[PDB]
């Protein structure tokens, strides 16, 4: 316990930069889902002025 | 039974205005009847057995064989009427050298034969009405040496009609017993 | 180990019996049936050697009609089977069924059962009666049973947890000619009461708390919970503990003003205890408003005497005394010359517990108060005022001289109440 | 089993000797071994809906309030 | 495609009656009509009647049957007279007042008769060259009470109405002056309330059963009692169920359960046979010699008339069904949970396989653990249990639960948590253990009801889908809260998207709406079917199915990221309330609120 207690503050960071990351990947990735869908408001308009 | 109930000066047994007064005794008819009618001198119901044989119709007050009844009280007191027929009851008793004796009080004898088990013993009620007072802690002093623990069963054979079959821990006079326990 | 012994008398004392005896079970680890799964309950349940648990309390009524609730509810195999004394006819709003020719039948069970019970407790410390003002049997049956348990055994304290008739609302008629005849019993064979009344506690349940429809099975909750405060110390562990005497020395200064108020501090939901800091300061400025009383009168018309607290959880002494030397500082709270100390503390290591399906949150401090104070001489004389326009034209009285009571103890205890009143105010004035 | 003739005798000899009458010897010793859907539960007590307790449901579906009883002195009065 | 049904109605009187080729036998259900074969094959359910059918009943020569059914009061109610060849409605008959207590066919196919109103009673008469009526009367005695029943005669003219509170009255009907004309049959001192009826073959004497328990006999020629019923034995509740015979035996039967042979001066049991649950249906079938009972719980029995031995042949529940849950990994297996009742099934056969009750309470959801362990259900008398797989005991219950019913429960995947949300709102989780099962922490965000709590498939968070307009996600290692769902519906179902991207939500206002896992953002919303209700979805392991059941006929099969709709919804209107798939991906199998479990095969969306 004592020898690990040395790097008490970079698993505290390190654990906030993941879930950081992995939230807004999944926002990424469902972003790609919504853009792929084709019955989308914005997408109709796209395709009426194409 | 009647281990943890209280055992204070009057305890009861069987009174006949009741929605079941027989719910704890058990009862062997054979050769007779038992009912509730109405007697036509205290004006109020009794119980009715009767029967051509003495020894086969019986109520017994512990229902179950092997279960006894345990009261400490010193005085068995009945009410029963005369019918000039033959009637007989029965008790047993526990003593403190831890047996079991008894004592019957049958109509028709005239030698009470002091036993190791069974001392039998005669009776003779009055023309009427009468109730009976029994008085088991001298019966057991004087006829077997030893004296009064327990009483553990009770049993009434043939020809009686039955009221109000009570434990005392005196003898009360008819002033002193309260109003319910009177006769009439 | 350091025993109680709870009788609870009619049938308003048995119904808030049956909601004081599952936050006993919930408090230490014992199930309903009385097994214990996994000596701090030594007070309340003795223990059998087949890992049973019996309780310290007798419930009596003479009628069989709510017994008969509890004898095949969910707490059946937990009583004794002669904890449980019934009849077959009550008392019908009248003292003198009760406390006179029906009612002296079922004393001997109740004073077997009393012996039996406080012949097995190795160290026995009072006694936790909970009768109702109100009742033909809750308020005979007990005056006929403590008139005689003083002779058996005397010196030990009387503790009374009574349901007090509240000024606007009641449920009977003849509550003036029932409430007035038991205080010839609890003045001189009794050592303190605590009343409590059903107005306020709707009161203080529907505007701290969001019930609409409140209920008995919501009052019966909060006064067992004062209870289980009140009985904090004989069972648990702190910095400060006060004993069934070390308060109830405290609290009779004079031997005819033994009728203190009760108030028990936290009473919040489960929504809104999140926005409140729940401090004790404030929890302790809580307790000295007019508005949670749980007894209808306001104490700042009057005086406070002398008072007690009850504390527990999660406090530590420093403020405490912050806390009560503001108290001593305000205005709104006034005493009297002959008490100018007129605080007690005691403290305790636990935190309240929450019963299931209780609208009450896990606080974590706690506070009971219990005062003697002289302005429950105006809930008395609102009462006082009930007696004598139904005497002067002697309405109901042949119901009470037909089951053996005679006229004139309707003048004795008036002019008993009348020299109890009187005493009041001779102790309020200054000197 | 039977380890002697005693035993073969009494160890099933299947004979009263007080209700067994003028016998013979073979009608004395005769041992035994010569003569020879849908499924349901049921909750034990019966229970009633009238004697519940967890709550006392408001006349008006409140969720929607029917006939507005407000908080005394401001605010939501239910759930 | 459509197959195995399953369920019954035997609720309302004389519901079974097999058509004399004696092959079909027809019954209703909750909103229509259903005719089995000998092979099971469905068909036809015959569509309408806005609402509950009520009475059935059959002419004689086996082309025409005839439901009436129940409104609101002040509401018409509709006979419709349909066919036995090509299964079309001929005639909608709607001229009553609140709904049609009682039909009957003439053994010459032109006349039908009909009682109608609980409160406005009367009897008007059909004919069936023109759907229209030829005259009515108000067939219930002013100063004596209401009717129930009526039967024609085979005089062709002539039809009784029947004591509801004991009036008797025979009308006689004679087309000219166009008139059906009261007398009634004078009793002496007798006054019961009659039950049942049936008439003879030579129409010599008519048998009433009572609900005191006597099987009287009556003489429609002298207008006058003719017999008395049993002393000694009457039998135990009302008469509910008397047939005839050819012969003159007539077949007795008593709402509580009892079946007896009886004969007409001496009305003594020949032949008894205890059944189960009351009857309230016999049906003969014409070759005579095998016949069926119809009772109260929805069991047909098959029971032959030689030797009286009988073969229940169909079961179901008797309430509003809700909740059904598959095991995960076995698709054989069905639990159905409903009002004082919790069945398990089969899926295949289905056969029943076991049966646990509740006295009289309520149940609310069923669920499984993620083992076969146990069965945890919810119920509203404040109680949560849980009972054995086999054997239905009693493992454990939870005292004093919510202050209301607990309505929606859900099982941890670990088999140690288990989260409870019910009417009042203080979402609670029970922590279970071999010993004892405690209470950690109750959550009080929501304001109104709960209606379903579905939990993450690796536990960390859950969802309840609740009828306030805030479906929450809490989080389940810490117990605070994340994400609030605030819409515009009263939510019925919100279901997981596998591979746990987001969360979609139905309910009452018909919007599927796909919900983005992350500040309960809307992303689409498409429509119901129309002006219905929506109150059970499904996805399937992979995630590209999905389907939806609800408040109209309807199921409907649709595409994940599309909307694709797949109707093959032509089952039964009685609300759908609950819907999952088979864990194989075989079977989609619903629940229809008035008791009728349906499954279809596995569509390709």
């Known amino acids: ?14 654990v906030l930069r993941a879930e950081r990351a992995a939230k807004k990947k999944m926002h990424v990735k469902s972003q790609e889902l919504v853009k792929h869908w084709t019955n989308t408001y914005a997408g109709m308009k796209e395709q009426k002025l194409k | 039974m009647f281990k943890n109930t209280f055992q204070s000066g009057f305890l009861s047994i069987l009174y006949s205005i009741g929605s079941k007064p027989l719910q704890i005794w058990d009862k062997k008819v054979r050769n007779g009847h038992i009912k509730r009618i109405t007697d036509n001198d205290i004006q109020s119901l009794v119980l009715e057995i009767e029967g051509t044989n003495v020894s086969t119709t019986y109520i017994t007050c512990p229902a179950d064989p092997k279960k006894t009844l345990g009261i400490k009280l010193p005085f068995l007191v009945m009410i029963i009427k005369n ?7 029965e008790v047993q008793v526990l003593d403190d050298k831890n047996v079991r004796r008894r004592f019957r009080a049958s109509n028709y004898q005239s030698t009470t ?20 007072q029994f008085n088991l802690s001298d019966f057991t002093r004087r006829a077997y040496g030893t004296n009064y623990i327990e009483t553990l069963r009770v049993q009434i054979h043939a020809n009686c009609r039955i009221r109000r079959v009570y434990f005392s821990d005196r003898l009360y006079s008819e002033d002193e017993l309260p109003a319910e326990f009177k006769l009439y | 180990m350091r025993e109680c012994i709870s009788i609870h008398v009619g049938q308003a004392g048995v119904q808030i019996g049956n909601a004081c005896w599952e936050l006993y079970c919930l408090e230490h680890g014992i199930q309903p049936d009385g097994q214990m799964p996994s000596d701090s309950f030594n007070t309340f349940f003795s223990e059998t050697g087949a890992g049973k648990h019996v309780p310290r309390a007798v419930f009596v009524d003479l009628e069989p009609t709510v017994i008969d609730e509890v004898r095949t509810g969910t707490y059946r195999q937990l009583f004794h089977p002669e904890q449980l004394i019934t009849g077959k006819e009550d008392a019908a709003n009248n003292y003198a069924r009760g406390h006179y020719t029906i009612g002296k039948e079922i004393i001997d069970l109740v004073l077997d059962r009393i012996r039996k019970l406080a012949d097995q407790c190795t160290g026995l410390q009072g006694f936790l009666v909970f009768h109702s003002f109100g009742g033909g049997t809750g308020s005979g049956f007990t005056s006929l049973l403590m008139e005689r348990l003083s002779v058996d055994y005397g010196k030990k304290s009387k503790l009374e947890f009574s349901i007090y008739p509240a000024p606007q609302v009641s449920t009977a008629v003849v509550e003036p000619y029932n409430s007035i005849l038991t205080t010839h019993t609890t003045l001189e064979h009794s050592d303190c009461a605590f009343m409590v009344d059903n107005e306020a506690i709707y009161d203080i349940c529907r505007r701290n708390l969001d019930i609409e429809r409140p209920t008995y099975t919501n009052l019966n909750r909060l006064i067992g919970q004062i209870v289980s405060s009140i009985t904090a110390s004989l069972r648990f562990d702190g910095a400060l503990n006060v004993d069934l005497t070390e308060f109830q020395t405290n609290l009779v200064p004079y031997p005819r003003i033994h009728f203190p108020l009760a108030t028990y501090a936290p009473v919040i ?3 809104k205890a999140y926005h409140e800091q729940l401090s004790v300061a404030e929890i302790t400025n809580a307790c000295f408003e007019p508005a949670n009383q749980m007894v209808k009168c306001d104490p700042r018309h009057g005086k406070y005497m002398a008072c007690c607290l009850l504390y527990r959880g999660d406090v530590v002494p420093k403020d405490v005394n912050a806390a009560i030397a503001t108290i001593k500082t305000k205005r709104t709270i006034q005493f009297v010359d002959w008490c100018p100390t007129g605080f007690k503390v005691g403290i305790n290591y636990q935190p309240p517990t929450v019963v299931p399906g209780g609208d009450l949150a896990k606080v974590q401090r706690a506070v009971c108060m219990l005062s003697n104070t002289t302005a429950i001489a105006e809930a008395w004389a609102r009462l006082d005022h009930k007696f004598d326009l139904m005497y002067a034209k002697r309405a109901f009285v042949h119901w009470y001289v037909g089951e053996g009571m005679e006229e004139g103890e309707f003048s004795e205890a008036r002019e008993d109440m009348a020299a109890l009143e009187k005493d009041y105010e001779e102790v309020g004035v200054d000197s | 089993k039977i380890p002697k003739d005693d035993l073969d005798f009494r160890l099933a000899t299947l004979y009263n000797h007080h209700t067994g009458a003028f016998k013979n010897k073979t009608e004395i010793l005769l041992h035994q071994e010569t003569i020879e859907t849908i499924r349901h539960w049921i909750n034990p007590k019966k229970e009633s809906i009238h004697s519940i307790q967890g709550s006392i449901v408001s006349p008006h579906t409140a969720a929607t309030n029917g006939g507005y009883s407000r908080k005394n002195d401001g605010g939501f009065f239910s759930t | 495609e459509l197959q195995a049904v399953i369920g019954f109605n035997g609720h309302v009187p004389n519901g079974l009656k097999c058509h004399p080729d004696q092959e079909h036998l027809i019954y209703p259900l909750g909103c229509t009509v259903l005719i089995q074969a000998i092979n099971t094959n469905e068909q036809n359910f015959l569509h309408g009647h806005g609402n509950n059918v009520s009475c059935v009943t059959i002419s004689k020569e086996g082309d025409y049957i005839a439901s009436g059914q129940v409104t609101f009061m002040g509401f018409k109610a509709d006979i419709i007279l349909w066919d036995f060849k090509k299964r079309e409605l001929i005639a909608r008959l709607s001229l009553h007042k609140g709904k049609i207590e009682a039909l009957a066919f003439s053994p010459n196919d032109l006349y039908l008769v009909s009682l109608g109103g609980p409160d406005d009673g009367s009897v008007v008469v059909w004919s069936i060259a023109k759907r229209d009526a030829i005259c009515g009367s108000p067939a219930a005695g002013l100063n004596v009470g209401n009717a129930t029943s009526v039967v024609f005669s085979r005089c062709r003219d002539e039809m009784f109405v029947t004591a509801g509170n004991g009036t008797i009255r025979v009308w006689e009907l004679d087309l000219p002056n166009r008139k059906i004309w009261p007398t009634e049959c004078q009793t002496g001192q007798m006054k019961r309330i009659v039950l049942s009826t049936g008439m003879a073959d030579d129409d010599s004497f008519f048998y009433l059963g009572t609900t005191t328990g006597d099987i009287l006999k009556m003489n429609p020629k002298t207008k006058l009692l003719a017999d008395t019923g049993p002393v000694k034995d009457k039998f135990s509740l009302g008469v509910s169920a008397l047939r005839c015979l050819k012969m003159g035996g007539l077949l007795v039967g008593s709402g509580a359960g009892l079946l007896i042979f009886c004969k007409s001066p001496s009305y003594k049991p020949i032949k008894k ?7 309230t249906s016999i049906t003969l079938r014409g070759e005579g010699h095998q016949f069926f009972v119809g009772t109260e719980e929805s069991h047909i029995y098959r029971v032959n008339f030689t030797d009286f031995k009988e073969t229940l042949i169909a079961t179901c ?35 029943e396989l076991l049966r646990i009750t509740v006295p009289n309470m309520t149940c609310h959801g069923i669920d499984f653990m993620r083992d076969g362990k146990s069965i945890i259900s919810a119920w509203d008398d404040g109680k949560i249990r849980a009972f054995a797989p086999e054997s239905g005991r009693l493992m454990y219950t939870i005292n004093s639960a919510h202050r209301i019913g607990v309505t929606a429960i859900a099982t941890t995947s670990d088999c140690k948590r288990i989260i409870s949300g019910g009417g009042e709102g203080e979402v609670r989780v029970w922590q279970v253990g071999c010993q004892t099962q405690k209470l950690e922490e109750a959550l009080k965000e929501h304001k109104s009801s709960v209606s379903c709590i579905r939990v993450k498939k690796n536990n960390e968070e859950c969802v309840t889908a609740s009828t306030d307009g805030t479906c929450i996600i809490w989080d389940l290692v810490r117990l605070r809260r994340n994400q609030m769902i605030l819409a515009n519906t009263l939510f019925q179902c919100v279901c997981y998207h596998p591979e746990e991207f987001q969360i979609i939500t139905s309910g009452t206002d018909r919007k599927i709406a796909y919900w983005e896992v992350f500040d309960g953002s809307v992303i689409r919303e498409l429509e119901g079917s129309l002006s219905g209700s929506i109150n059970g979805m499904d996805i399937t392991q992979e995630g ?4 939806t059941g609800g408040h109209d006929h309807l199921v409907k099969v649709w595409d994940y990221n599309e909307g694709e709709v797949t109707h093959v919804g032509v089952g039964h209107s009685g609300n759908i309330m609950a819907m999952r798939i088979s864990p194989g991906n075989q079977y989609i199998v619903s629940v229809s609120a008035d008791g009728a479990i349906l499954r279809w095969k596995y569509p390709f969306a």
């Open chain 1, 1 to 14: 316990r004592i020898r690990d207690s040395l790097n008490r503050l970079t698993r505290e960071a390190a």
């Open chain 2, 83 to 89: 019918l000039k027929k033959y009637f007989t009851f």
């Open chain 2, 113 to 132: 034969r002091v036993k190791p088990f069974i001392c039998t013993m005669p009776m003779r009620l009055d023309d009427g009405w009468n109730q009976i």
């Open chain 3, 269 to 271: 939901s489960a929504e």
């Open chain 5, 273 to 279: 046979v205890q059944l189960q649950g009351g009857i």
């Open chain 5, 317 to 351: 529940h008797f309430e509003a069904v809700q909740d059904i849950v598959f095991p995960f990994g076995t698709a054989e297996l069905f639990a159905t949970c409903a009002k004082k009742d919790i069945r398990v099934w089969h899926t295949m056969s289905k056969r």
């Open chain 5, 544 to 547: 590209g199915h999905f389907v």
